[PDB]
Amino acid sequence: MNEVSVIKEGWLHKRGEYIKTWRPRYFLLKSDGSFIGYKERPEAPDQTLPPLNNFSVAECQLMKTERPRPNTFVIRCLQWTTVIERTFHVDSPDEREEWMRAIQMVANSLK
Numbered sequence: 001m002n003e004v005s006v007i008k009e010g011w012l013h014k015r016g017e018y019i020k021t022w023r024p025r026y027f028l029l030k031s032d033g034s035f036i037g038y039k040e041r042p043e044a045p046d047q048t049l050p051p052l053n054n055f056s057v058a059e060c061q062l063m064k065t066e067r068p069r070p071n072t073f074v075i076r077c078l079q080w081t082t083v084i085e086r087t088f089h090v091d092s093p094d095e096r097e098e099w100m101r102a103i104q105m106v107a108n109s110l111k
Contacts, residue, residue, distance in 0.1 A: 008028075011095075012090055014085065025039060025053065026039075029099065034054070038052055060077030
């Protein structure tokens with residue numbers, strides 16, 4: 001199996017500071033039920049850049065919340081990720097629904 005394309009690409013806000021601040025990261029979701037977060041938008045064909053954040057939604061489930069900010073996504077299932085992402089924020093309310101919609105549509109084929 002190796003024919004998974006990208007389903008949705010957008011910027012997400014994740015906390016990353018000594019205080020309570022969230023920074024925007026370019027996240028890309030694929031049809032395999034997994035989306036990776038990138039600090040910037042790298043895309044060099046001569047020196048492909050590795051993914052910084054790896055988020056997988058094949059198992060367990062995520063829940064939409066409003067804390068600390070509105071339109072936020074929380075997940076309680078750590079399997080084998082280098083970073084510990086419990087809750088992440090989206091760029092907008094319409095984007096929060098787009099991510100949830102993709103997870104449900106990809107879940108149909110993910111099984």
